[model samples]
Target: SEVAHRFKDLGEENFKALVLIAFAQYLQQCPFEDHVKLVNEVTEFAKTCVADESAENCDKSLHTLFGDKLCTVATLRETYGEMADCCAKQEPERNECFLQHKDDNPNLPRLVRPEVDVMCTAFHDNEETFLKKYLYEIARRHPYFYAPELLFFAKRYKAAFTECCQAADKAACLLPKLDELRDEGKASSAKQRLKCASLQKFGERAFKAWAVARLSQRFPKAEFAEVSKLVTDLTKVHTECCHGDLLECADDRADLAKYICENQDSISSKLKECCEKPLLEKSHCIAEVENDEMPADLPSLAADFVESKDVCKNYAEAKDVFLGMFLYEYARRHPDYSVVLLLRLAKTYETTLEKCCAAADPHECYAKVFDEFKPLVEEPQNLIKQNCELFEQLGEYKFQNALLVRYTKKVPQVSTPTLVEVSRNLGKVGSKCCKHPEAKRMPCAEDYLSVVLNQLCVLHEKTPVSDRVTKCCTESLVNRRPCFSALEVDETYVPKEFNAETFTFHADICTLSEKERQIKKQTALVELVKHKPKATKEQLKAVMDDFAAFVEKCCKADDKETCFAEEGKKLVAASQAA
Candidate 1:
């Protein structure tokens, strides 16, 4: 009753679906004898609710029956409740609507994989039941996967069990296969995610062209009209699905899937078997079909590349569309290159044109832009990848510290405060982008982190620059980030002597905003590190913590300035002693 009350606004159909999905998930690990009993109990409860409308003890009974066996009530409410909006759609629209919007709820608990021995035992005890349970478990955990994908995973699991259960060491035989399946699923999801991101970034027309180019190349024998139609359907699916309108995406994809199946003869012979599979299975199979050699009749992208004279005009007429076309052309030609690389090419092209459009010799400026593009593209790609790999390996705290240590040593002449600020900002870029999906992470890091290097260059322009900083700053914008990455430590440099006067701890420090206060703390840490170069991170962290604690304590005192002045000397004394 409480569950019903909690989801009162969710219409009957939606509520029923939520209950059934959750119940099915719970029943997967349940004993076979208890299933029919549990099902009948739920069915009776549903009938009672329908008949009575205000059934007493319903909530208590349901809770007692399922309780911890099902997902937490809160999870069910939060996760499935997202589908409330979909319930309001027409009856025919509802199922696809729910299917598309499922699995995104972060509140859904992660399902742990069953132990190897337990899995083998379950399979041996009841092969048919275990397979069904396995399918349900996989489907429950990966609700975003299509039915065919889930079935394929289940088939693999069954095969693994059949092969490994009889082996000398079951775990040794099965564990790697299980991990391989996980990796395969992860790779598939990532590939699909990148396509969705591309559709959203490039828009409908550009995405369609790219898709048609790619798919047509894969199925070279398919008619142009047929290929175009298929691309159009695929693009519609991505456009809606990528933008969070999953219902329409599902409906459109279903139509596309149907078209591929029904008109198999119109497409390639390679896809014929793929088309004969079940609906979602057929779509997955068709998607997995590898590309054939480029057809002789397939058009070249060389003609699509804009001339220098037309670049500004074409860009001005429709910026994104023109840029999208450029991306499409570039991508089709360099099919082996990554999406991030192609995206970088487009960005560089746009920026170069932007500058050239305002230049005195626009044609001359634009003509050499392509000449400069090749070198510009590869460096940022490599630099960002290396940076992210280190960032991921070190984690945020150590990564930031590593940047601080590296930059401080490389540019010993730069102000500690400036180096600290630069290190923090660069670290922020890593933390922000590293968490993004793999497809989007590098481009995100490259774009944002490059701006930090640009700022550093600008800041150093008016100030004294060391040989290392000078080398990086004078490089072209495209080369600057990599230059900084490869910068060597200034071996001739020495650490500045510790200065106690720098730890003023004035009354203003207590009165400053949180942002300013943080800057003050960071400055102090940098000063300590610069002076005490041999201090361990643990030691430095201890000092930082002590300083923070002292500030918190002294800030509240009536004689705040006096307290800081007295404590400041003691902190400096303690630091010097350490």
Candidate 2:
């Protein structure tokens, strides 16, 4: 009851952190039977955090709350440091202090842990079927007798196996380790100095018994035995081989099968010796060669003969580099053809040229096509320079990241005057939307505008000055679109326009631009004099001098057009009064 009241007083966010920290500490003493219950408690707490508005997506929610570092035992204990110390004090003191700390304090820091430098060494070891899961359970199934040293031996020797494969002399470095693994005098019992000692059959029939007894066993006993024999023999050969660099023993089943058939009764004999072990040890040995069971630290070695590939390589391939190179040459050869035929010729040639690179001598094949086509691809791109400049300006907003501007670039009817107007519209987007109230909702304000404007240009290619374009740029300001429409007609200086209209808004109650303020002052003074027709000369002069300062402050010094128009409205008003 006291814990509940104290947590209620604390801000909900911090109180949740306290509960998580407290429970994590309690788990140190929790029994395996209650592990499921504790997990449910954590999972339920997690659901509330998910439903909160701040959690836009689960991955982002996790990132924004915790950041990059993964939480570990050391990190959780550190956050609970003060709480643990408080709870450890005398009963009355501990209770009072813990209650006070939990009460609505916003100063408590959120759980944030620093990063640790970790190096991954194993990259290629993998688990097969039930082999991986059963290995993890070995420490539990027979907790008193699990051999951690076997796994340790596997890791250290495998590290050297990779080193030997790449080295010119395969057996030079391995011999020393092989010697140490055999000698108890040089290597301690903890060390298991027998270099290839894990080569022996482990847990013979006893392991086989464990496998048969378990319901979740993944493979039949004989098959598991067969896999184990092939794997350990391969290791033994690595322990003794220059006659074979172990390439033929690779996990490519066809390749390995071919090599095993060719090599003779020797490799087959090695397999038989390995499979005699119990199921637990047999599958682990097979896991060494399977790609699916890759160890967390093993660095993968790609095939030397094939080109390295990733997602980027595929994208680059699809772009067809030869096409980008062929355009100029193709254009020159097709001078007899019109520009349309020339473009079509180059494009069609580009579509077909990719097949040539698959030839045995790709360079020679590509050279033949280039020699055939290069003589003609050159041609003039008349409007390309100006379009390039426009693209450059758009890139200033979001360089390689910008999208829709390319559509703008490709517009055939575009002119310098047309593009200049487009740039002006783009500039206004930043100040109007990015600085406005709801800017926080957007990830990238300028980039957001770029995407919208690009799509708008593409959608309405013919109408550069469309109302849709104007609204997209300006309507983001809160209720200010109406004011932009009011700006279109400067009504204050025109007596015929203002007097004819019935709209009258008082100053201080309305918002106006600087020029609007100047125009308003002039309108008020002129109307004031016309309504009071018999106004004194002194009042007229005072209004003129006062309004002159207003115009100078708000409108440009050389804006005599508006200044003259104000005086013109005054003249017309006074004459009508007379």
Best by TM-score: 1
Residues 151-203, candidate 2, lDDT per residue (tens digit)?
A: 33334444544565355654565556644643322122211212111222122
Q: State the lDDT at 418 in candidate 2.
A: 39
Q: List candidate 2 stretches off by more than 4 Å.
A: 1-360, 363-425, 428-511, 514-578
| Candidate 1 lDDT score relative to the true structure | 0.60
Whole-model Cα lDDT per candidate? Answer: 0.60, 0.33
The regions of model 1 sitting more than 4 angstroms off are 1-148, 162-173, 192-228, 239-282, 295-304, 308-324, 350-365, 380-578
* Every model's TM-score: 0.46, 0.16
lDDT of 1 by residue, 112-142 (tens): 6688889899899998667755554553444
Candidate 1, 347: how far from true, in Å? 3.6
> Candidate 2, residue 481: CA error in Å?
28
